[PDB]
Design an enzyme around this catalytic site. Sequence first.
Site, PDB file in Angstrom:
ATOM      1  N   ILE A 276      11.673  16.761   0.904  1.00 45.03           N
ATOM      2  CA  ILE A 276      11.750  18.033   0.326  1.00 45.03           C
ATOM      3  C   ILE A 276      12.145  17.959  -0.770  1.00 45.03           C
ATOM      4  O   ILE A 276      13.343  17.750  -1.048  1.00 45.03           O
ATOM      5  CB  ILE A 276      12.237  19.200   1.421  1.00 45.03           C
TER       6      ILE A 276
ATOM      7  N   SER B 116       5.844   7.424   1.974  1.00 46.97           N
ATOM      8  CA  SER B 116       6.821   8.773   1.668  1.00 46.97           C
ATOM      9  C   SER B 116       5.603   9.866   1.707  1.00 46.97           C
ATOM     10  O   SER B 116       4.498   9.724   1.525  1.00 46.97           O
ATOM     11  CB  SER B 116       7.199   8.546   0.258  1.00 46.97           C
ATOM     12  N   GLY B 117       6.297  11.026   2.053  1.00 54.55           N
ATOM     13  CA  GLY B 117       5.804  12.200   2.226  1.00 54.55           C
ATOM     14  C   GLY B 117       6.322  13.571   1.603  1.00 54.55           C
ATOM     15  O   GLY B 117       7.510  13.814   1.982  1.00 54.55           O
TER      16      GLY B 117
ATOM     17  N   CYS C 129       0.709  -1.062  -0.055  1.00 57.94           N
ATOM     18  CA  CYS C 129       0.020  -0.030  -0.021  1.00 57.94           C
ATOM     19  C   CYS C 129       1.013   1.326  -0.028  1.00 57.94           C
ATOM     20  O   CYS C 129       2.127   1.014   0.410  1.00 57.94           O
ATOM     21  CB  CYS C 129      -0.987   0.035   1.067  1.00 57.94           C
TER      22      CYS C 129
END
EC number: 2.1.1.45
Lengths: 263, 263
Positions: free
Chosen positions: B210, B169-170, B148
Amino acid sequence: PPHGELQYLGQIQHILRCGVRKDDRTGTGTLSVFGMQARYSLRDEFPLLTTKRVFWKGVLEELLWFIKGSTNAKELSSKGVGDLGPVYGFQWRHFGAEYRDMESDYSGQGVDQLQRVIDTIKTNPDDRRIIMCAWNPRDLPLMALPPCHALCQFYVVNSELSCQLYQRSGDMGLGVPFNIASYALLTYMIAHITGLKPGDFIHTLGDAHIYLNHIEPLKIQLQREPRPFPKLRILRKVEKIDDFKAEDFQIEGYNPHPTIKME
Amino acid sequence: PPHGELQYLGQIQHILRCGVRKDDRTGTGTLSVFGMQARYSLRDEFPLLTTKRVFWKGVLEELLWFIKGSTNAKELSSKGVGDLGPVYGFQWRHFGAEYRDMESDYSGQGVDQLQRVIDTIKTNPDDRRIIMCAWNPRDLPLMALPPCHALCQFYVVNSELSCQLYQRSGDMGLGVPFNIASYALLTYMIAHITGLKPGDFIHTLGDAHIYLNHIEPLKIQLQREPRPFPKLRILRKVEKIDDFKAEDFQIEGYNPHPTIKME
């Protein structure tokens, strides 16, 4: 830098003071807090907690049992630490395959999550999908597509392998210290076969809880001061995750406080 | 108590100073840190970040689109914020069912993860398995049993509903602020239909990153001071998650800093 064990001790402290009363599946009480995380460095040290003696022998022996994909309780107990059904081993090595019996041959049957993780690491280290999941066998017959109990996500950067374990619930007194050492060990093994250096082990929890009958023993463990974490050594060059033997590992410099029994 | 937004700003600060260079799927660069977590109270306040204007309209409109299970990009864009395939909506309401086309009738087809979450909450609030998962459609044809992308775990105690979102992951600059508001909103909705009070929203990340081209705009956002979070109001008694309409919600007291474009 503060000793890594202080996060665990700090988390225990937080649950005792701010935890909310919540009953588990069997109506047994706990003090609970939702959402927790700690990070343990695996660089030149192994996070085998010291404010109590952790059953390392059981950690190492059980992990190796899982890697074999075994579903025979005897193959474990015999080590000094019986069809058990589709346990973590079977799910780790034969995910998706239907379970018959601890004798059946499941070669090439199901998805080998563990080998897949190792393969993805050596074919594409930047991948954000190096994930391995595990289910509580109990939940399998319970419903269609049951939610996992735990998921392990691996991450690579600068020749360093890190691992984050997310568990939907965590028994802070008995399970957590054992699991921290278990997954830290798995990270050490995978890093060793993929030629990487262990980085960090991040432990994240959903329902982090303390069982009522563990409160007093933990209040006492909290009065103890952590000692420098020990070191883990792999005194042999291993190439296949399946080739690891208990005698390949050696915990060094481990002088913990006395064992603490948790009911 | 420190403003909740300080964790986000603090996390951004940490990635800029300690983040490691890591390329994403398209070879695009980022500064990365593995393992992150923040907790935002949903009690008498809504975590719609203030150090920049968050596209609330897009949050509310997209979430409602997901709840409908729609796989038609037009049904979303038309709102002011095209077959898209098995997107989050289809997975949330028709998990397991094979996707044909955005017109096909999938009633009773697949597992309704969302309704299941709501049902489990009202039949057994102590459950440690109130989990909902989502996949990147891209990964579906890629392999057998793909991991997922995100999982949401709900938790109930003292008539309060909390939610923890774990994402492998963000995108700290674009995705995170939007998702914090998105899932905080989902928690508000589910709590409203299950008669509970919103508690906490916990956001956990694997690869928190970032993108290189966001560094300067974020360095500037970091110079901004958070304003008291606004409040979210549901000015109507709703009983079915499917009955929510955009006009049912009202963000109050939201005076954020100026919009910040992120490439």
